[PDB]
Design a protein around this ligand. Structure first.
Ligand code: HEM
Ligand code: HEM
Ligand code: A1H6T
Ligand code: A1H6T
Lengths: 372, 386
């Protein structure tokens, strides 16, 4: 089985298992702002509460779980401070009392000082009842931006798909051992089990329609998910007062930072990061926005022999069909996700396309990997 | 690679799967000089680029070629030679005499086998450092050592372009730096086993190798002249990514519908310099700045096994964090000797770029100087003591 140094959980995969909900009492001033973002933003009191904070030291965040929660807390606060009510009045400077500990904690965890997928999805969750299973009914997010932003449905359904896809990660060492030991039947069973997991993850995706509405997602949630890299509203980036002199550019939170989808593209030899195109550049860049242990895991998968080249060289129809079932399952996930992006982004944008092209390129690359 | 999945990133040995040679490091050991007779038409053009370009006959010879199948290139060495052959031909076809008459479409009979062979080797269809430096060499006498006098390049662009001196001296520096790569597993084993004296000896041995590599660099002046380098060689080293002359990239006829953008050959694609920056925790690829983005992007222009080696070094524990935490002057000084050796190499290289690029450019820009100054500055700021 996969090394503990990669920080992949047997149950939740790349998600942070049982994330911390409360920080030490020393950080109550950060927690108050983070827990009341909807109210402070709406009332125009948020920027003042952030500006009134004292610079708190990161030294009292003793373990990884408390450091991850503080990163989620500070990152949510930073998005609300920069974007405000989300109507054009942006802030181009982040106050030193929040920027200094945010950048120091970010340097410690090897993550950029901006809200990432590992913060808002992987560490932004809790079980309502610890004795009940990981189902939507028994779960909640830790932080939201606005009342009615559908951040619970959006972040939780992504997390549930991450968790569903994680049951196929345990099969990865079985695949590489079967190839090395030349165990054809073992490899075929392993590939069919990965396909089975990815097919099941598509059913999990269907839940998006019951917990997210297009108007609230597009007009409200979208604003706080935005970053400051190539953003016309913050063309030079954000100033991290007291940490860097010049404004720094960082891309906003993205599911392109999910390690579970990138690890199946690497496993199946779908060269998403090859060819010098825009989609390849984006997905490669998003690896530096992943937790270092997860970024290391992706490297290690790439360093292993190609499953695609192995299957292509055997002249075995059963093995080729098991490989194609894995690729077809990823194509179906991405095709369904394209229909979702049309419903939640494309159509609401018309009632008020570069993202669609990115998703269509990634999907096309997956489709072109079928051996047929 | 299978044990790294179960036990974790622990590079206590340099696996043969990384394709690092004990003698030449990241360079391709004893590269192939001749292709099978089936490819004689490719070899004739590649071997006579200076003459065909000068006479205006090159584009016609390329356009008259038949589409040759890549199936007859059976091993890695023949595939690497063919990539160097086709890449040199592509630079000459696109740039011509180097005076503004560019070609925006690469003929299918050369673009199809170039892109197929590139896809096979996981390298972009443009001449890279692993082609023009690492695989562009031969020993004149196999029984004599790896010295400039006993070596030659396989391909050149123009008569008097100094490509032999430029490519061979880079190769000799790569080879000199390679003797420090064998010490990398000694460093990670010493840290794991907490063998302080072993670690100190290992760090001083790496510094010794990098210091010796600076002396190898001095040979550049005897084999390259600034006028020929700047006015002639520079042209053929250019790519088509952010290039005003080919703003949309090159069309690889019969392979892709749209023009694709690929950056030109760069020593930023050298794995030996990037591996010591990673080893010493000089975070060249961090911060989101232009230098960081460039060096990260250049990893996809490296051979896949070498790109894998770099990310495996990043996955391993930090030598810098280990040395910083020990309160040991001798260990800090051995680490600083390694960093100071890289600062000296980059400072000397800045003087070289002034001589060969800056001054000739002025006798008729500084964006490359700023890139080199940022990389040098990052190295200098990694010293634990000034
Ligand atoms: C309200 C529903 C959703 C919308 C509107 C949506 C939107 C988007 C957009 C705009 C992108 C492009 C990258 C970017 O801009 O950051 C993207 C990428 C992606 N999304 Fe979603 N998404 C939704 C639900 C989900 C769910 C539930 C998952 C499951 C984990 C998910 C997984 C991905 C992945 C893996 C990518 C990266 C590209 C790929 O590998 O295909 N998305 N999404
Ligand atoms: C005629 C002499 C030389 C000139 C004019 C020259 C020029 C350049 C230029 C313009 C760059 C910036 C990146 C790019 O534009 O692609 C560069 C980078 C670099 N060069 Fe050279 N170079 C010379 C000799 C050498 C030699 C002999 C080596 C040895 C292998 C070398 C190693 C490097 C490295 C490692 C980089 C990447 C940046 C760094 O890590 O500092 N150069 N060079
Ligand atoms: O990529 C982001 C993201 C950004 N946007 C967006 C919306 C409208 C206009 C521009 C960007 N939509 N999603 C993302 C996050 Cl942060 C979390 C989970 C997830 C699932 N699929 C995508 N996910
Ligand atoms: O980085 C390239 C390179 C690019 N340029 C250049 C100069 C002027 C205008 C445009 C490009 N010069 N050298 C390079 C190659 Cl391809 C091979 C060895 C080497 C050593 N140092 C740099 N090396």
């Amino acid at each position: 089985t996969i090394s503990k140094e990669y920080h992949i959980d047997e149950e939740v995969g790349f998600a942070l298992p049982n994330p911390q909900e409360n920080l030490p009492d020393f950080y109550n001033d950060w927690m108050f702002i983070a827990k009341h973002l909807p109210d402070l933003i709406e009332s125009g009191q948020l920027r003042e509460r952030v500006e009134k904070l004292n610079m708190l030291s990161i030294d009292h965040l003793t373990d990884h779980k408390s450091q991850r929660l503080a990163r989620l807390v500070l990152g949510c606060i930073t998005m609300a401070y920069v974007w405000g009510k989300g109507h054009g009045d942006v802030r181009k400077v982040l106050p030193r009392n929040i920027a200094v500990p945010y950048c120091q904690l970010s340097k410690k965890l090897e993550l950029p000082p901006i809200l990432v997928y590992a913060d808002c999805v992987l560490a932004n969750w809790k079980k309502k009842d610890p004795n009940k299973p990981l189902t939507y009914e028994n779960m909640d997010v830790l932080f939201s931006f606005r009342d009615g932003d559908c951040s619970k449905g959006f972040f939780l359904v992504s997390l549930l798909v991450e968790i569903a896809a994680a049951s196929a990660i345990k099969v990865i060492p079985t695949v590489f051992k079967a190839m090395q030991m030349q165990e054809r039947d073992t490899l075929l069973k392993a590939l069919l089990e990965i396909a089975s997991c990815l097919e099941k993850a598509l059913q999990v995706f269907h839940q998006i329609h019951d917990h997210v509405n297009p108007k609230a997602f597009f007009s409200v949630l979208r604003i706080y998910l935005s970053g400051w890299k190539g953003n016309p509203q913050l063309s030079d980036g954000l100033v991290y007062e007291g940490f860097w002199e010049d404004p720094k550019e960082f891309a906003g939170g993205s599911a392109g930072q999910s390690s579970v989808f990138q690890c199946f593209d690497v496993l199946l030899g779908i060269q998403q990061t090859a060819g010098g195109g825009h989609a390849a550049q984006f997905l490669q860049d998003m690896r530096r926005y992943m937790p270092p242990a997860h970024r290391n895991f992706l490297c290690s998968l790439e360093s292993n022999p190609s499953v695609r080249e192995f299957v292509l060289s055997k002249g075995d129809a059963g093995l080729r069909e098991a490989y194609d079932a894995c690729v077809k399952a990823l194509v179906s996930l991405r095709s369904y996700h394209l229909q979702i992006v049309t419903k939640y982004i494309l159509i609401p944008a018309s009632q008020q396309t570069d993202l669609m092209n990115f998703l269509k390129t990634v999907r096309s690359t997956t489709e072109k990997s079928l051996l047929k």
